Structures are given as C-alpha cells and as structure tokens.
Amino acid sequence: EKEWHIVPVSKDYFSIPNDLLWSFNTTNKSINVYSKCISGKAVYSFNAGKFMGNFNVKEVDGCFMDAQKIAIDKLFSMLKDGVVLKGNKINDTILIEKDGEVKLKLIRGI
Numbered sequence: 001e002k003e004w005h006i007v008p009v010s011k012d013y014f015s016i017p018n019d020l021l022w023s024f025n026t027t028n029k030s031i032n033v034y035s036k037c038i039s040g041k042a043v044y045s046f047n048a049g050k051f052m053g054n055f056n057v058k059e060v061d062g063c064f065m066d067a068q069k070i071a072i073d074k075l076f077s078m079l080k081d082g083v084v085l086k087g088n089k090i091n092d093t094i095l096i097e098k099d100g101e102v103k104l105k106l107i108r109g110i
C-alpha cells in the first residue's frame, strides 16, 4: 500500500487543503482519501492510463474556506469524469492530466 499527497499544477487547485492523503492498497485494490475534514472510499476503474472514480465524499460543515470548497468539489468532479495518470520509472510521482494540461501531481508520502 502506497500513499500520496497532491501538489496542484492548475490554478483550480491552488486552494486544495494540504492534508488530503490518497491511499492505494495493492492487495485488495482499495483507494481511499483521508483528511481532517474530508473522507472517501473510491469506486473506480483504471485502464490504459485512464482513471475514473467516485469517492462518496463526507465533508465537515464550515471547516473549509469558500475557495477550498470549490477546489475540492472540482477535484472530485474531475476524478469522476476521468483523468490520465502518467507515472515514471524513477520514483512514485504521478502526473494527473486532463484536457491537454497537467492538473496536478501526486507526490509519495504524507
């Protein structure tokens, strides 16, 4: 099982809260997201570099700034619609791509 955090690349995501942690379990195939104010377990598909998932999110009222909420909302909407994941053979960083651009990167670790 590995975990990552986001480093946003697109401005839609500059306000994403920093404590979101994304986990993938290689044994049972589970994907979760965890933070102080959001949780979600993914129903998902990942084929040919294309990832799409529904995280069934819970969110704490009043915990986020308006800008953070919009960024979070947009992120889960984008993940549902589908993104392309670009890994590499050097380390565990993954670029998340959509609509001709890099939207964000996943950096391994908390």
Ligand SMILES: CCCCCCCCCCC
Residues within 6 Å of the ligand: 006, 022, 023, 024, 031, 046, 051, 079, 096, 106
């Ligand atoms: C090998 C699959 C690892 C990808 C898990 C991350 C879920 C995609 C959402 C990123 C915010």
